[PDB]
mmCIF file of C-alpha atoms in Angstrom:
data_model
loop_
_atom_site.group_PDB
_atom_site.id
_atom_site.type_symbol
_atom_site.label_atom_id
_atom_site.label_comp_id
_atom_site.label_asym_id
_atom_site.label_seq_id
_atom_site.Cartn_x
_atom_site.Cartn_y
_atom_site.Cartn_z
ATOM 1 C CA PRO A 3 119.106 104.697 55.061
ATOM 2 C CA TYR A 4 116.285 103.247 56.214
ATOM 3 C CA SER A 5 113.091 104.972 55.572
ATOM 4 C CA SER A 6 110.357 103.738 58.439
ATOM 5 C CA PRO A 7 110.725 101.447 61.301
ATOM 6 C CA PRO A 8 111.252 97.229 61.166
ATOM 7 C CA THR A 9 107.640 95.522 60.026
ATOM 8 C CA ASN A 10 108.515 92.641 62.562
ATOM 9 C CA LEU A 11 110.856 91.227 64.803
ATOM 10 C CA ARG A 12 112.498 89.343 61.703
ATOM 11 C CA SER A 13 113.360 92.421 59.860
ATOM 12 C CA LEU A 14 114.345 94.163 63.416
ATOM 13 C CA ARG A 15 117.319 92.016 64.058
ATOM 14 C CA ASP A 16 118.219 91.896 60.759
ATOM 15 C CA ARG A 17 118.481 95.701 61.056
ATOM 16 C CA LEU A 18 120.677 94.807 64.043
ATOM 17 C CA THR A 19 122.905 92.332 62.680
ATOM 18 C CA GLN A 20 123.912 94.889 59.737
ATOM 19 C CA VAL A 21 124.423 97.979 62.034
ATOM 20 C CA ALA A 22 126.732 95.647 64.074
ATOM 21 C CA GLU A 23 128.853 94.410 61.626
ATOM 22 C CA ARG A 24 128.907 98.075 59.866
ATOM 23 C CA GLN A 25 130.128 99.827 63.889
ATOM 24 C CA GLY A 26 132.359 96.582 64.673
ATOM 25 C CA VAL A 27 130.905 95.293 67.255
ATOM 26 C CA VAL A 28 128.866 92.322 69.064
ATOM 27 C CA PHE A 29 125.356 91.277 67.660
ATOM 28 C CA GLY A 30 124.606 90.077 70.990
ATOM 29 C CA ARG A 31 126.259 92.877 72.770
ATOM 30 C CA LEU A 32 123.793 95.699 70.706
ATOM 31 C CA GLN A 33 120.609 93.673 70.687
ATOM 32 C CA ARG A 34 120.769 93.737 74.795
ATOM 33 C CA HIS A 35 121.978 97.511 75.247
ATOM 34 C CA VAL A 36 118.596 98.101 72.558
ATOM 35 C CA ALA A 37 116.142 96.613 75.165
ATOM 36 C CA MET A 38 118.249 98.613 77.533
ATOM 37 C CA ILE A 39 117.324 101.449 76.175
ATOM 38 C CA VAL A 40 113.601 100.124 75.624
ATOM 39 C CA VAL A 41 113.553 99.603 79.383
ATOM 40 C CA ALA A 42 115.006 103.024 79.863
ATOM 41 C CA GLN A 43 111.990 104.646 77.944
ATOM 42 C CA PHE A 44 109.552 102.638 79.899
ATOM 43 C CA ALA A 45 111.133 104.288 82.995
ATOM 44 C CA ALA A 46 111.820 107.516 81.690
ATOM 45 C CA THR A 47 107.846 108.149 81.067
ATOM 46 C CA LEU A 48 107.715 107.657 85.824
ATOM 47 C CA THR A 49 107.262 111.011 86.739
ATOM 48 C CA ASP A 50 106.078 112.837 90.056
ATOM 49 C CA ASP A 51 103.749 115.292 89.785
ATOM 50 C CA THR A 52 105.477 117.332 88.488
ATOM 51 C CA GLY A 53 107.176 116.108 85.793
ATOM 52 C CA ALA A 54 110.585 115.145 87.633
ATOM 53 C CA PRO A 55 112.095 111.250 87.049
ATOM 54 C CA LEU A 56 110.419 108.861 89.566
ATOM 55 C CA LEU A 57 113.535 106.353 88.422
ATOM 56 C CA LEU A 58 117.535 106.607 87.334
ATOM 57 C CA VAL A 59 119.320 103.996 86.285
ATOM 58 C CA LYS A 60 122.546 103.510 87.684
ATOM 59 C CA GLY A 61 124.844 101.050 87.521
ATOM 60 C CA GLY A 62 126.464 98.930 83.831
ATOM 61 C CA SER A 63 123.732 100.169 82.480
ATOM 62 C CA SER A 64 124.565 103.707 82.675
ATOM 63 C CA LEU A 65 127.841 103.305 82.703
ATOM 64 C CA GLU A 66 127.151 101.854 78.933
ATOM 65 C CA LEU A 67 124.782 105.264 77.810
ATOM 66 C CA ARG A 68 128.290 107.403 79.025
ATOM 67 C CA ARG A 69 130.678 105.438 77.015
ATOM 68 C CA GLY A 70 129.301 103.604 74.441
ATOM 69 C CA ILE A 71 129.098 99.979 73.539
ATOM 70 C CA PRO A 72 132.757 100.264 72.848
ATOM 71 C CA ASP A 73 133.767 101.314 75.740
ATOM 72 C CA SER A 74 132.306 100.029 78.171
ATOM 73 C CA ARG A 75 132.146 96.858 80.169
ATOM 74 C CA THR A 76 128.757 94.081 78.910
ATOM 75 C CA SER A 77 126.148 94.692 81.582
ATOM 76 C CA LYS A 78 123.670 92.103 81.677
ATOM 77 C CA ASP A 79 121.220 93.996 84.731
ATOM 78 C CA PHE A 80 119.181 97.396 84.023
ATOM 79 C CA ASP A 81 119.618 98.749 88.039
ATOM 80 C CA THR A 82 117.985 101.844 88.963
ATOM 81 C CA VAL A 83 117.607 103.998 91.812
ATOM 82 C CA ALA A 84 113.678 105.538 92.841
ATOM 83 C CA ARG A 85 113.616 108.801 93.753
ATOM 84 C CA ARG A 86 110.129 108.239 95.579
ATOM 85 C CA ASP A 87 109.052 104.669 96.660
ATOM 86 C CA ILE A 88 109.218 101.182 94.808
ATOM 87 C CA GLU A 89 105.811 99.368 95.355
ATOM 88 C CA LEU A 90 104.851 102.323 93.149
ATOM 89 C CA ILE A 91 107.225 101.638 90.852
ATOM 90 C CA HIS A 92 106.507 97.849 89.526
ATOM 91 C CA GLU A 93 102.752 98.960 88.743
ATOM 92 C CA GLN A 94 103.879 102.466 86.995
ATOM 93 C CA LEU A 95 106.620 99.955 84.674
ATOM 94 C CA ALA A 96 103.862 97.079 83.983
ATOM 95 C CA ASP A 97 101.283 99.401 82.767
ATOM 96 C CA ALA A 98 104.313 101.360 81.056
ATOM 97 C CA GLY A 99 105.344 98.356 78.857
ATOM 98 C CA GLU A 100 102.044 96.808 78.095
ATOM 99 C CA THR A 101 101.058 100.672 76.925
ATOM 100 C CA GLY A 102 104.168 100.581 75.045
ATOM 101 C CA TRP A 103 107.166 102.438 73.096
ATOM 102 C CA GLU A 104 107.855 102.647 68.751
ATOM 103 C CA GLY A 105 106.230 98.577 68.653
ATOM 104 C CA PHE A 106 107.813 97.311 71.679
ATOM 105 C CA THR A 107 105.583 96.175 74.225
ATOM 106 C CA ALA A 108 106.829 94.718 78.064
ATOM 107 C CA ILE A 109 105.307 92.239 81.014
ATOM 108 C CA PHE A 110 106.718 92.289 84.130
ATOM 109 C CA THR A 111 107.575 89.223 86.374
ATOM 110 C CA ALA A 112 106.795 89.492 89.737
ATOM 111 C CA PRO A 113 109.048 91.871 92.572
ATOM 112 C CA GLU A 114 111.273 90.027 94.981
ATOM 113 C CA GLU A 115 113.693 91.493 98.059
ATOM 114 C CA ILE A 116 116.780 91.485 98.601
ATOM 115 C CA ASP A 117 118.435 91.121 102.025
ATOM 116 C CA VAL A 118 121.275 93.978 101.940
ATOM 117 C CA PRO A 119 122.908 94.548 104.833
ATOM 118 C CA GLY A 120 123.199 99.107 105.220
ATOM 119 C CA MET A 121 119.811 99.706 103.395
ATOM 120 C CA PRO A 122 117.210 99.901 105.753
ATOM 121 C CA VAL A 123 114.527 99.071 103.050
ATOM 122 C CA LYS A 124 115.626 96.501 100.777
ATOM 123 C CA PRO A 125 116.608 96.240 96.477
ATOM 124 C CA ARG A 126 113.636 94.843 95.063
ATOM 125 C CA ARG A 127 114.306 92.204 91.168
ATOM 126 C CA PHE A 128 112.278 91.373 88.240
ATOM 127 C CA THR A 129 112.779 90.769 84.882
ATOM 128 C CA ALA A 130 111.129 91.968 81.703
ATOM 129 C CA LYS A 131 110.043 90.425 79.342
ATOM 130 C CA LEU A 132 109.680 92.714 75.895
ATOM 131 C CA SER A 133 108.220 91.967 72.706
ATOM 132 C CA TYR A 134 107.821 93.536 69.325
ATOM 133 C CA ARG A 135 104.921 94.173 67.753
ATOM 134 C CA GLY A 136 103.911 91.029 68.531
ATOM 135 C CA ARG A 137 106.600 88.617 69.455
ATOM 136 C CA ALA A 138 109.199 87.936 71.964
ATOM 137 C CA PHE A 139 112.696 90.046 71.809
ATOM 138 C CA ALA A 140 114.396 89.518 75.006
ATOM 139 C CA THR A 141 114.977 89.013 78.763
ATOM 140 C CA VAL A 142 115.949 91.905 80.494
ATOM 141 C CA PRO A 143 116.978 91.488 84.454
ATOM 142 C CA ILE A 144 116.395 94.552 86.132
ATOM 143 C CA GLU A 145 117.063 95.752 89.742
ATOM 144 C CA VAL A 146 115.805 98.980 91.738
ATOM 145 C CA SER A 147 116.769 100.405 95.206
ATOM 146 C CA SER A 148 115.262 103.271 97.308
ATOM 147 C CA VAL A 149 117.451 106.577 97.337
ATOM 148 C CA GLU A 150 120.181 106.488 100.472
ATOM 149 C CA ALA A 151 120.990 110.622 101.049
ATOM 150 C CA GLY A 152 121.253 112.759 97.835
ATOM 151 C CA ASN A 153 122.050 110.018 95.381
ATOM 152 C CA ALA A 154 118.679 110.971 93.077
ATOM 153 C CA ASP A 155 118.752 114.521 94.898
ATOM 154 C CA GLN A 156 119.581 115.906 90.945
ATOM 155 C CA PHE A 157 120.755 113.616 87.526
ATOM 156 C CA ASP A 158 122.336 113.021 84.410
ATOM 157 C CA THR A 159 120.233 112.503 80.733
ATOM 158 C CA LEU A 160 121.813 110.526 78.173
ATOM 159 C CA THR A 161 121.078 109.539 75.299
ATOM 160 C CA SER A 162 121.784 106.792 72.252
ATOM 161 C CA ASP A 163 121.390 106.403 69.106
ATOM 162 C CA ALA A 164 121.387 102.973 68.540
ATOM 163 C CA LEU A 165 117.335 102.614 67.792
ATOM 164 C CA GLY A 166 117.980 105.184 65.123
ATOM 165 C CA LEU A 167 120.505 103.430 63.502
ATOM 166 C CA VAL A 168 117.541 100.816 62.567
ATOM 167 C CA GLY A 169 114.823 103.154 62.263
ATOM 168 C CA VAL A 170 113.230 104.079 65.164
ATOM 169 C CA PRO A 171 113.878 107.629 65.269
ATOM 170 C CA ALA A 172 111.899 109.014 69.067
ATOM 171 C CA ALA A 173 114.646 110.608 70.779
ATOM 172 C CA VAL A 174 115.467 108.637 73.753
ATOM 173 C CA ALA A 175 116.921 110.759 77.055
ATOM 174 C CA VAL A 176 117.297 108.735 80.296
ATOM 175 C CA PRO A 177 117.682 110.401 83.487
ATOM 176 C CA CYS A 178 120.860 108.675 85.247
ATOM 177 C CA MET A 179 122.585 108.500 88.770
ATOM 178 C CA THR A 180 125.452 111.082 88.253
ATOM 179 C CA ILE A 181 128.846 110.243 88.759
ATOM 180 C CA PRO A 182 129.688 111.061 92.238
ATOM 181 C CA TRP A 183 127.139 109.186 93.477
ATOM 182 C CA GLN A 184 127.719 105.853 91.198
ATOM 183 C CA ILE A 185 130.985 106.452 92.533
ATOM 184 C CA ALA A 186 130.399 106.449 96.205
ATOM 185 C CA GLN A 187 128.457 103.851 96.203
ATOM 186 C CA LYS A 188 131.261 101.506 93.822
ATOM 187 C CA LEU A 189 133.892 102.405 96.322
ATOM 188 C CA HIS A 190 131.474 101.049 98.658
ATOM 189 C CA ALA A 191 130.530 98.056 97.231
ATOM 190 C CA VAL A 192 134.245 97.103 96.379
ATOM 191 C CA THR A 193 135.572 97.429 99.313
ATOM 192 C CA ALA A 194 133.221 95.423 101.206
ATOM 193 C CA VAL A 195 133.907 92.370 103.937
ATOM 194 C CA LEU A 196 130.756 89.888 103.819
ATOM 195 C CA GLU A 197 129.588 87.700 106.075
ATOM 196 C CA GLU A 198 131.350 84.607 106.672
ATOM 197 C CA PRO A 199 129.962 82.325 104.142
ATOM 198 C CA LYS A 200 129.395 84.954 101.425
ATOM 199 C CA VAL A 201 132.596 86.037 99.662
ATOM 200 C CA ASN A 202 133.129 89.845 97.620
ATOM 201 C CA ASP A 203 132.796 88.760 94.539
ATOM 202 C CA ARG A 204 132.725 92.488 92.767
ATOM 203 C CA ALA A 205 137.028 93.165 90.773
ATOM 204 C CA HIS A 206 134.606 94.387 88.238
ATOM 205 C CA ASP A 207 134.396 97.480 90.209
ATOM 206 C CA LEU A 208 137.463 98.285 89.199
ATOM 207 C CA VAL A 209 137.556 98.260 85.814
ATOM 208 C CA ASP A 210 134.190 100.418 86.404
ATOM 209 C CA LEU A 211 135.812 103.385 88.785
ATOM 210 C CA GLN A 212 138.554 103.282 86.403
ATOM 211 C CA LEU A 213 136.101 104.059 83.657
ATOM 212 C CA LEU A 214 134.584 106.822 85.943
ATOM 213 C CA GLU A 215 137.500 108.175 86.557
ATOM 214 C CA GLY A 216 138.771 109.287 83.528
ATOM 215 C CA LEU A 217 135.235 111.369 83.414
ATOM 216 C CA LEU A 218 135.276 113.023 86.310
ATOM 217 C CA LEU A 219 138.032 114.156 84.398
ATOM 218 C CA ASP A 220 139.454 117.866 85.387
ATOM 219 C CA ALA A 221 136.306 118.383 88.053
ATOM 220 C CA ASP A 222 136.845 119.514 91.886
ATOM 221 C CA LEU A 223 136.051 115.684 93.365
ATOM 222 C CA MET A 224 134.387 117.859 96.586
ATOM 223 C CA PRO A 225 131.166 116.757 95.495
ATOM 224 C CA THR A 226 132.706 112.758 95.148
ATOM 225 C CA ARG A 227 133.835 112.939 98.400
ATOM 226 C CA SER A 228 130.819 114.451 100.115
ATOM 227 C CA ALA A 229 129.099 111.963 98.588
ATOM 228 C CA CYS A 230 131.211 109.712 99.699
ATOM 229 C CA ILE A 231 131.527 110.244 103.170
ATOM 230 C CA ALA A 232 127.748 110.655 103.178
ATOM 231 C CA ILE A 233 126.595 107.180 101.635
ATOM 232 C CA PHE A 234 129.863 105.138 103.546
ATOM 233 C CA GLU A 235 128.341 106.510 106.522
ATOM 234 C CA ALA A 236 124.441 106.298 105.657
ATOM 235 C CA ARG A 237 125.059 102.411 105.651
ATOM 236 C CA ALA A 238 127.345 102.270 108.340
ATOM 237 C CA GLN A 239 129.758 99.359 107.635
ATOM 238 C CA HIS A 240 133.613 99.613 106.958
ATOM 239 C CA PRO A 241 134.284 103.894 106.938
ATOM 240 C CA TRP A 242 135.650 106.544 104.706
ATOM 241 C CA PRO A 243 138.805 106.367 103.607
ATOM 242 C CA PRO A 244 138.447 102.687 102.465
ATOM 243 C CA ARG A 245 141.488 100.149 101.544
ATOM 244 C CA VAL A 246 141.200 98.007 98.305
ATOM 245 C CA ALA A 247 142.122 95.363 99.081
ATOM 246 C CA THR A 248 141.769 92.530 96.403
ATOM 247 C CA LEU A 249 140.622 88.930 97.021
ATOM 248 C CA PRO A 250 142.892 86.082 95.708
ATOM 249 C CA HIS A 251 140.496 84.591 93.603
ATOM 250 C CA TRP A 252 140.244 88.541 91.909
ATOM 251 C CA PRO A 253 142.939 88.472 89.465
ATOM 252 C CA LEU A 254 140.519 86.432 86.955
ATOM 253 C CA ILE A 255 137.381 88.094 87.358
ATOM 254 C CA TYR A 256 139.241 90.690 86.804
ATOM 255 C CA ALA A 257 140.466 89.374 83.722
ATOM 256 C CA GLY A 258 137.448 88.508 82.926
ATOM 257 C CA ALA A 259 135.647 92.139 83.048
ATOM 258 C CA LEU A 260 138.641 93.644 80.794
ATOM 259 C CA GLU A 261 137.029 91.613 77.639
ATOM 260 C CA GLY A 262 137.038 93.801 74.826
ATOM 261 C CA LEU A 263 138.882 97.182 76.329
ATOM 262 C CA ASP A 264 142.243 96.511 75.205
ATOM 263 C CA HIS A 265 141.896 99.597 73.610
ATOM 264 C CA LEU A 266 141.470 101.182 76.408
ATOM 265 C CA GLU A 267 144.169 102.593 79.062
ATOM 266 C CA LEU A 268 143.330 100.862 82.140
ATOM 267 C CA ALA A 269 145.719 98.505 84.583
ATOM 268 C CA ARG A 270 145.937 95.467 82.844
ATOM 269 C CA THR A 271 146.434 93.363 86.032
ATOM 270 C CA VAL A 272 143.425 93.617 89.529
ATOM 271 C CA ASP A 273 146.671 95.330 91.578
ATOM 272 C CA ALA A 274 147.587 97.668 89.343
ATOM 273 C CA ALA A 275 143.526 98.396 88.881
ATOM 274 C CA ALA A 276 143.636 98.372 92.955
ATOM 275 C CA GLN A 277 146.599 100.769 93.213
ATOM 276 C CA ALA A 278 144.914 102.809 90.512
ATOM 277 C CA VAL A 279 142.128 102.513 92.794
ATOM 278 C CA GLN A 280 143.615 103.199 95.988
ATOM 279 C CA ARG A 281 145.253 106.403 94.305
ATOM 280 C CA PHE A 282 141.968 107.909 93.457
ATOM 281 C CA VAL A 283 140.427 107.721 97.249
ATOM 282 C CA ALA A 284 143.693 109.469 98.400
ATOM 283 C CA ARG A 285 141.842 111.895 95.637
ATOM 284 C CA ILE A 286 138.929 112.060 96.553
ATOM 285 C CA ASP A 287 139.749 112.065 100.417
ATOM 286 C CA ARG A 288 142.037 115.271 99.732
ATOM 287 C CA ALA A 289 138.983 116.931 98.202
ATOM 288 C CA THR A 290 137.890 119.672 101.177
#
């Protein structure tokens, strides 16, 4: 029961060590979750002049927020979508970082762009260098993409009590892309055919797509169908509905992506994962 925040970086890490052992989790994982939460709190301070989020969390960080550390893949990336524009995001986050949150501060590396076919405006990558009460704490790779169709019309707001458990009580509340659009974008990515020297390595999306299907539960799959149509049309690459092929090097990638998830009811082989996701494609495609 911590009565006050950690005094310095050394005390922070001792508490994280204690919580990680209490919860049966690897320290490095809890530590990197905390760093993503800190970054997310900076991003949640970014609003338009109505108070609406400028940045929505997506990708593996989002799944780790939705499912919890035990029930999600280890994510290294903090992926986000910018609701309004992307060049103003970098300077707004750096101000957020300098201003700080609960003792944490951040400095952000310069934004490099990326070529992605199908996206007129290009994603950006940079890095957050986090400090606690002066002493460097962790580094978080950040990617920012522009909005595509209605993938930023709405957002879910997710939380974590990880910082509470080490005596940082401030509320955590993170705006995230909704599940229909996460499914649409991961379905597109895992079935994408890459340019000759490039090769699709995204077998891990087969894990995430099973985890996201579990979370739609019995919901109408019609918002997910409309999101899939929109993404696949917006990107103007392979058509909807796609075929979930597996590539020759994917078996071990998929196995690597299953690490730590033995307790979940997931396909245990990449073939069965492809079969599971294909059935999910067909179910989404029948939802009118």
